[PDB]
Amino acid sequence: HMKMRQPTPYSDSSLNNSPLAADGSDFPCKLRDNAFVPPSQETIAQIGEVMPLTFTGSATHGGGSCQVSLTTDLKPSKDSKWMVIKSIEGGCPANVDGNMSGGADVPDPFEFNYTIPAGIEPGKYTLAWTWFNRIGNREMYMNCAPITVTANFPAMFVANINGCTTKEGVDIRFPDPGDVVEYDGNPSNLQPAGEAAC
Ligand SMILES: *[C@@H]1O[C@H](CO)[C@@H](O)[C@H](O)[C@H]1NC(C)=O
Ligand SMILES: O=C1O[C@H]([C@@H](O)CO)C(O)=C1O
Ligand SMILES: [Cu+2]
């Protein structure tokens, strides 16, 4: 149970910590009433700028693995096409063995980053954070935020809301993580070589 803090998600005041519905019904972005209201301040990401990726919550579930992905859709739906710009395998959204202290609203001390790469054209996008928790029930977490990019990619990995089911206890390694892959966890938790993520 975690949520993205930066970049600021759409409709943050109605955005909760819960994972996506196991049946896929609220993929993408936790579909719900008025799900796609932009925050007041525009999140501007210059190409090549190191941008913050930060979280709120203490129920870190031993970490896991995350992606950062972009779509041109400003009201994403099941038909939205996503472009992965970063994969974090292990240690996301925290490199601890279980949960942390603080409440549902605590700023997560473990912080991350992403950079818009050279192949993304300037324009408005939705950015998604997705997270596959290491410990606990097999879930997929997802929050979405508008960003404006100012002056060839894998499709998003989707699991646990379909037939692809991940293995409990491991930091998964995405089949097609892209050219920007970061390992932020303990090597002993990385999914063993030769096992598929599903
Ligand atoms: C982004 O975060 C990763 C993981 O902590 C770190 O290795 C890297 O140095 C960070 N980038 C910058 C520019 O600080
Ligand atoms: O509505 C918008 O207009 C500009 C657009 O030019 C961005 O590509 C901007 O920053 C918005 O949020
Ligand atoms: Cu949880």
Three-state DSSP class for residue 198: coil
- In whole angstroms, what is the distance from residue 171 CA to residue 189 CA? 6
Question: Can you spell out the DSSP letters for 89-150?
Answer: ESSSS--SSS--SS-TTPBPS--EEEE--TTSPSEEEEEEEEEEESSSS---EEEEEEEEEE
Nearest residue to 20 via CA among 184, 156, 196, 176: 156
Which residues lie at CB < 5 A from ion ligand 3? 1, 59
Name the 3-class secondary structure at 64.
Answer: strand
For ligand 1, say whether the CB of 89 is within 6 Å of any of its atoms: no
CA distances from 96 to 20, 84, 186, 189 (A): 23, 25, 9, 11
Q: How far apart are CA 143 and CA 57, in angstroms?
A: 13
Closest-CA residue, ligand 1 atom 3, reads 112
Please enumerate in sequence order all residues whose Cβ is within 8 A of that of 104, keeping only pairs 6 or more positions apart, or say none. Answer: 1, 17, 56, 57, 58, 59
Question: Exposed, middle or buried, 3 (CB in 10 Å: 0-12/13-18/19+)?
Answer: buried
- CA 42 to ligand 2: nearest atom: 12
Q: Residue 37 CB: number of other CB atoms within 10 A?
A: 13
Fold (CATH) for 1-188: Coagulation Factor XIII; Chain A, domain 1 (2.70.50)
Which residue CA neighbors atom 11 of ligand 1 most closely? 113
CA distance 13 to 17: 12
Instruction: Identify whether the C-beta of residue 60 lies closer than 8 Å to the C-beta of residue 1.
Output: no
- Give the pair of three-digit tokens for residue 89: 């395998």
| Pairing status of strand 141-150 against strand 44-46 | parallel
Please enumerate in sequence order all residues whose Cβ is within 8 A of that of 167, keeping only pairs 6 or more positions apart, or say none: 191, 195
Say if residues 78 and 179 touch (Cβ distance below 8 Å): no
As a whole number of angstroms, the longest Cα–Cα distance in the chain is 46
Task: Look at residues 147, 146, 176 and name the one whose alpha carbon lies nearest to residue 159.
Answer: 176
Q: In the numeric block, which tokens belong to residue 186?
A: 């303990």
Question: Which structural technique was applied?
Answer: X-ray
First to last CA, the chain: 22
* Distance from Cα 149 to the centre of ligand 2, integer Å: 9
DSSP state of 193: T
Task: Give the resolution value in Å.
Answer: 1.3
Give me 70's structure tokens. 């972009």
Q: Tell whether ligand 1 has an atom less than 6 A from the beta carbon of residue 50.
A: yes
| Residue 70 half-sphere exposure toward CB, CA atoms < 13 A | 22
Among 46, 148, 149, say which to mutate for ligand 2: greatest number of ligand atoms within 8 Å of CB: 148
